[PDB]
Structure formats: C-alpha cells, structure tokens
Write an enzyme that holds these catalytic residues in place. Structure first.
Site, mmCIF file in Angstrom:
data_model
loop_
_atom_site.group_PDB
_atom_site.id
_atom_site.type_symbol
_atom_site.label_atom_id
_atom_site.label_comp_id
_atom_site.label_asym_id
_atom_site.label_seq_id
_atom_site.Cartn_x
_atom_site.Cartn_y
_atom_site.Cartn_z
ATOM 1 C CE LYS B 38 -4.074 2.112 0.722
ATOM 2 N NZ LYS B 38 -5.240 2.081 -0.201
ATOM 3 C CB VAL B 40 -0.354 6.674 -1.368
ATOM 4 C CG1 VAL B 40 -1.040 7.895 -0.781
ATOM 5 C CG2 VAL B 40 0.919 7.071 -2.151
ATOM 6 N N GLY B 170 -16.442 -6.111 -6.010
ATOM 7 C CA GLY B 170 -16.038 -6.067 -4.619
ATOM 8 C C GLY B 170 -17.146 -6.295 -3.612
HETATM 9 O O1 LIG Z 1 -11.309 11.873 -5.829
HETATM 10 C C1 LIG Z 1 -10.368 11.205 -6.304
HETATM 11 O O2 LIG Z 1 -10.472 10.610 -7.375
HETATM 12 C C2 LIG Z 1 -9.058 11.154 -5.572
HETATM 13 C C3 LIG Z 1 -9.097 10.184 -4.360
HETATM 14 C C4 LIG Z 1 -7.890 9.721 -3.898
HETATM 15 C C5 LIG Z 1 -7.848 8.870 -2.808
HETATM 16 C C6 LIG Z 1 -8.999 8.490 -2.208
HETATM 17 C C7 LIG Z 1 -8.826 7.549 -1.024
HETATM 18 O O3 LIG Z 1 -7.812 6.884 -0.969
HETATM 19 C C8 LIG Z 1 -9.846 7.475 0.062
HETATM 20 C C9 LIG Z 1 -9.720 8.554 0.864
HETATM 21 C C10 LIG Z 1 -10.328 8.073 2.239
HETATM 22 C C11 LIG Z 1 -10.280 6.419 2.167
HETATM 23 C C12 LIG Z 1 -9.582 6.135 1.100
HETATM 24 C C13 LIG Z 1 -9.978 4.743 0.453
HETATM 25 C C14 LIG Z 1 -9.112 4.416 -0.728
HETATM 26 O O4 LIG Z 1 -8.003 3.933 -0.577
HETATM 27 O O5 LIG Z 1 -9.506 4.628 -1.872
HETATM 28 C C15 LIG Z 1 -10.246 8.943 -2.672
HETATM 29 C C16 LIG Z 1 -10.296 9.789 -3.742
#
Ligand SMILES: O=C(O)Cc1ccc(C(=O)[C@@H]2CCC[C@H]2CC(=O)O)cc1
Ligand SMILES: O=C(O)Cc1ccc(C(=O)[C@@H]2CCC[C@H]2CC(=O)O)cc1
Lengths: 226, 227
Positions: B38, B40, B170
């Site tokens: 993971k 990020v 999922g």
């Molecule tokens: O809006 C966009 O496209 C950009 C975007 C980037 C990352 C995420 C996340 O990572 C989530 C944020 C809180 C849980 C987490 C869950 C996950 O890993 O996806 C959501 C949106």
C-alpha cells in the site's frame, strides 16, 4: 448550424439534468435559443423524465427524445430487459443535427456516463459527440472520487479528440466540507469549472432556478457559447 | 522476480481492500507467497489502514507501506493538508521492486481509482504499473455507474498498455436485483470477472473469509498468477 454541447457526467446522479437545465436557463436568459436533446431516457418506470425537468426548470420547449425505457438501468441493459433495441447511431446523430441551427444552443444529455452504450451497435455519447463535432461539458461531483472519475472522463474525451468545454459541479454542498472545498481547487487544475450548482437546486421553482442559473455561470462564457 | 499486480478500482469505496485481502487469501491457500503493498495510505487519522485490514482478513504478514497521510482525502490533498509531500515515483517503485521475488504474488493496492495522483507530478498507479510491468486487477461495483466507470478504467489502462488482469466485483448482493445481475452480465462482456465477493465479506472472521476467498476465485486463475 449553431453550437452543440453534449452534456455528460462522471457517473449517475451527478446532476447532468439539473446542469442542462441550469445552462439552458442561463443561455435563454442571455437571449440564446436553447434546445435540449435527451436521445435515450431510462428509468421511466419510476418517472425519470429529464426533458420534463428541463422544461420545468428552464422553459426550454425544444425538448427532443428518441426512446424511453422503464427500467432504471443502463440503456443497453434497459433495452435488453425490455426486448427492444436501442435507437440507431443514425437517428441520434440526425436528430441532434436537425436540432442544430444558427443562434441555438443545442444541449445533448446522455444517460449515465460517457462510454455507456447509447445506440446500436456499442456506440457511445463520445462517438455521437464526434459525429456532430460537439464539445463535451462534463458534470462532476464534489465528493471523494471525483478527481479519478474526472481525469478518466477527460482522458476518454481526449482519446477521440472530443474537446472539453469544461466541468460543472452538479451539486455544491453546504457547508462545503474539507473534501469538496479541496476538490473544487483540484478540479479547476484539470479543466475550467463553468459553475458549481448549489445542492438542492433541482427542487427550486422555475423563477428561483432561473435566478440561480444566471448567477451560476460566467455571463460572458454563456453568451460566448453561440 | 515474481508476479506483481496493482489492484485498482473504478473509484473509492468499491472494495479494493477486501479484494486485495481475498485474492491474498486465495493465493496463500494455493501455496503462493503473498506480499500486499500500500504505497499511499490516506485517512490514517480516521483509522484507515488497508494493510492492517488485509493482514486482519487474509493473515498476510508481508505488508509494506510507504506514505501515510492523516486526512481521508486524495493523497495530494491529504499530503498538502498535513504539510507533507507525496512520495516520488521511484520511491513507490523501489518499495514494489524490493518485495518482488520469484514465486510471490505482490499486490499493490492503489489509493482510490486508477488515475489518482500518488506522487509528484501527476504520477498515478497506472504509471507505477508500467514501471514494475504489473497487470492491473480492477475492482468494480455491481451498482449504477459501473459500466461507464469500468470502461473508463480499462480504456485508461490500455492507453498505457497496462494489461488488465480482469475485474472483481467487490460487493455482490444475495439476492442480486435486476440492476446488479444485468451489470454483472455486462461486466463479464467487458473483461474477465475473476470474482464477485459476497456483500459484507469484510465482516467474516479469518476462516470464514479464507473459505469465502477460496470459493470466490477460480483456483486455476489464482494458481496461474505465479510460476
Ligand atoms: O477523488 C479522487 O479521485 C481522488 C481520491 C484519492 C484517494 C482516495 C482515497 O484513498 C480514500 C480517501 C479516504 C479512504 C480512502 C480509500 C481508498 O483507498 O480509496 C479517494 C479519492
Ligand atoms: O454506467 C453504468 O453502467 C450505469 C448507468 C448508466 C445509465 C444510467 C441511467 O440512465 C439512469 C437510470 C436511472 C436514472 C438515470 C440517470 C442518468 O441518466 O444518468 C444509470 C446507470
């Protein structure tokens, strides 16, 4: 002819219709003649009728459509469950092109998002947009995930050289919130954000919705549309 | 090295973690050594920790993180809000290449959807998959929105010649309604659907989850992931 915009969304329930309405309203208020074409409507079983919302909110009377499926599903899926094909690529394109006329803003609303099948065979709003040489105005959300969905959409658009006329945020939350506030800045780094419609805009009466609409878009952009 | 699969989704909240864990579990049971990666992790101030979840559900101990940002936002926003920078493209790639090893399935769980920026500038999981020559497994929902989202993701993968390893639904409801069923049928026409995990699979204890994971995936597909 005049100016044809296809209005697409990064998904479903993102405010496509309320956006068509809002820009139709704003362009009407700039003395632009507006037609709105929704070639394929679904979810009529429960009363989805985006052209009627447009007519109500925007007073557009050139509301043009080809097919209506009852099931609230994707056009091909609704057509499947109903046993009747989607329209043809040809009726969509010719319906839109006959709508088109100088001095008129012709808004083409898809069903769902950019690559969902709208006609036979496998033809999308992107192809339509190509065929009629229209740009795509992209309706996006303010919520988590919009940035991916928007990047994906503009990429798909660029892939077939469909120009992007910008993004509209279908529903601006109040209070904005950390994510939405962030996303608006972020979204504008990707494409011009023509407006952010306030949440609840679809429940307004015609007169309120007209005020909202005129205040929502940059006046010169609107007037510079045709 | 072994086999590296980035695991992306059509969005966020679509089930990337549960799928990661589920494919991890099915792989371990096939006797494949699994590392889950993971690069990020946002929302750590919320408790979000997908490696921990994948550990919890699949019993994976080969967990490897890199960046953690407290706010549950896009990496970029989470990073900026915390006064932090995103990792560099090669930091992510270095983390993955260090885990890659013959006989191992290395799963790289993205953040959100495929085109989320993971590293300055505009570096996405897609670019990372080019760098490590990973295929992408796309986690999708069965809900309204998905066929457009899946097609967008796959088109985006093909734009960089990042091969699609297939799709995982999922969350799959029991029973499936008209929409879900019709979405599954159409999804399977777009790409191979490698599994549809039953809804609430994340609430399964270890051996329930492992049982779910072994049935969810085609043993032949899983086995063929790693030589
Ligand atoms: O809006 C966009 O496209 C950009 C975007 C980037 C990352 C995420 C996340 O990572 C989530 C944020 C809180 C849980 C987490 C869950 C996950 O890993 O996806 C959501 C949106
Ligand atoms: O991409 C996919 O598979 C999902 C998908 C595509 C289109 C539609 C629709 O047309 C909806 C049917 C009920 C409302 C209406 C809203 C709208 O038109 O956006 C819904 C889901």
């Amino acid at each position: 002819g005049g100016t044809i915009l296809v209005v697409t969304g990064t998904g479903t329930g993102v405010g496509k219709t309320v956006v068509c309405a809002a820009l139709a309203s704003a362009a009407r208020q700039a003395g632009i003649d507006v037609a709105v074409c929704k070639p394929v409507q679904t979810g009529t079983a429960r009363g989805d009728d985006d052209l009627a919302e447009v007519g109500r909110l925007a007073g557009v009377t050139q509301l043009a459509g080809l097919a209506r499926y009852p099931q609230p599903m994707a056009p091909a899926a609704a057509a499947e469950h109903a046993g009747m094909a989607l329209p043809a690529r040809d009726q969509i394109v010719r319906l839109i092109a006959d709508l088109d006329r100088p001095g008129r803003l012709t808004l083409v609303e898809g069903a769902g998002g950019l690559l969902v099948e709208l006609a036979e065979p496998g033809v999308t709003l992107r192809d339509v947009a190509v065929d009629v040489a229209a740009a795509a105005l992209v309706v996006v959300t303010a919520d988590l995930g919009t940035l991916n969905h928007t990047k994906l959409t503009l990429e798909a658009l660029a892939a077939q050289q469909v120009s992007c006329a910008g993004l509209v945020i279908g529903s601006w939350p109040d209070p904005p919130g950390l994510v939405a506030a962030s996303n608006r800045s972020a979204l504008a780094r990707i494409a011009m954000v023509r407006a952010a419609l306030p949440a609840g805009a679809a429940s307004l009466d015609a007169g309120d919705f007209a005020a909202m609409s005129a205040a929502a878009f940059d006046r010169n952009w609107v007037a510079g549309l045709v």
